[PDB]
């Protein structure tokens, strides 16, 4: 007779439910799994055709080219209240959450078989013809609102009323316009077509993408619950929810849904999510002075004055000293060493 | 009940802002990340087409191939100045800046899903012929300016004004032509078309490309900021900054972007970097007198007058010597190196 | 001086193509702000 071993050891689930069940108070060991989703937005011209553009515009003259809001996929965007961990951080190490995995899939795109609803032929008594054509599929998890930067095509584009676009879009803005800078905070607001994660600055976040254009590039996609995605960064920490929030942006044209007529519109599946954090131990950045002089702004004033700041700060050169060093000959510390046009 | 953990030791930033933060003066243990990114230059026909080279030309006889530069995309380039590390540098030790990672990303993916703007259509009713065809991306990081090599297809091309194009092309040129080799000095002014880092020497930086070529590629790219490239050199050295300089170079043509009218004319966009510098301690290679030489030659007596050097040179005999030997019976006998050891036989 | 200058784009001054940089020299127990917010202006924002 053989004994059967105890069985292994394996994280205590402590509660399972929604949302709500992260009120509960655990240890400083725990941690927790978030389950979300996020629906797309395609454009939703009317009430039945959801995950859908509508439908596409063509040859558009640059000078006139203003599409309609319905036709322009926007970056879905969502933001997952967390439990504020530290009660009274009347002292110094205080707990963040910290997002470290992440599994993502496309929900449906199994449903990309219909090649027989509003369906164009595929030629003679063939099937339809499948969703096909240049798409992004991308995503981001960050303990902070996702920080973008517009870019465009024909700068001269003239943006539907309840989109948000590059504003004073200039040639420039057809390359690297420094001005474009952006965050995702209203969903369904921020056309993809005008704006990529600014990588000067996300260092909250964590994305990827990828574009694949193409008249008709095939979609292809893959659906698995054996997949993660770390979130941890070169010093091994990963998002930090600095305002007890998680957020969540994502974005999928899966591609072209190329109607009956010959009309095309852009096609969009949900994105999962199920995010692991953890209670990570941070040097409480917030507090005292910060409220003290967060305070005293609202006591004293605010000076419209003459400008000690950015491209015209009438501040001529400020030098900051620390100890004392012998007595340099030459006082112009020859800092760079001046190759212009030598 | 739970002890609310130490928190990790990370590194602790002294300064953020732009360039000038540079200079801090800094420990022999610091380092930075440089954010910088560059603009790219297709050929930018009209004010308003920036990111596009000028409506692309088809069949032209060999003979007869004078294009256009706002037709010719070229190579991107900058440099970074670095602060000179020295400046209270110890005794002969010696610091050079040193770049170890980069991480860089197309900049504006997402705009090629305007299928709505100057597009030729798809068909009948379809959206826009979205942008495709051959496209090349291709960047580089290193501590000198890019090395080319140039190289071409047809040699019997006119190049216009503004550009470097190799010199004096034969028909090797459109293979390999050793007289091509130059350097990434000028942005805007190489074209993409012409030139290739050579990879014979381009020994003090690191770089990247793929030629994906076709009449209607798919272009195919990610935007993440997860990913990092490393510089280190097979000793772990990655590009030293010679002069105290960092040097970035990039192309990104996307492809063709295909107008209402059928015309095609290549699409790019902005690339970004980050580079991370460190503190890199290395050996001044040369001597002292080789250095002052400069200042000597570069600013004391210059004469010309009879040629003691060259196959003219009118020094007819040196004799040079050291210590001492008994008598030698042959006087003319003729002592000399080889390549290392001495010699000593008669002339006849 | 031996080196070839190069005329390129920008990474300093009114047009610097460098949009940040940042420098580091020691360690720091893990600062619970991220894009150190060192000015009040600019909390937010």
Redesign the interface.
Known sequence: PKKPKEPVQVPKLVIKGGIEVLGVKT???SFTEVECFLNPQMGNPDEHQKGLSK????????TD?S?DKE?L?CYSVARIPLPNI?EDLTCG????WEAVTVKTEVIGVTAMLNLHSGTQKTHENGAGKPIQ??N?H?FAVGGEPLEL?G???????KYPAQTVTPKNAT??S???N?DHKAVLDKDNAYP??????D?????????????????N?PPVLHITNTATTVLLD????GP?C?ADSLYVSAVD?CG?F?NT????QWKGLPRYFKITLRK???????PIS?LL??LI?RRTQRVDGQPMIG?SSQVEEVRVYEDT?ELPGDPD?????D????
């Open positions: 240890g400083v060991d439908s596409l515009a063509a040859e558009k003259q640059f080219d599409p036709q996929p530290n190490n205080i707990l963040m054509g240049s992004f991308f930067q870019v465009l095509a024909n700068y001269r584009t040639v420039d057809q390359q690297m420094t993809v077509e005008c704006w990529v994660p990588p000067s600055k996300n260092e909250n976040t964590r994305y990827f993408g990828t574009y694949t254009g193409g008249e590039v070169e010093q091994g920490v930090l600095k044209i072209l190329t007529s010959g009309t095309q990570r131990s941070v040097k409480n950045p917030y910060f002089s967060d702004n491209m060093e510390m020859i800092r760079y060493i190759e212009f046009g030598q």
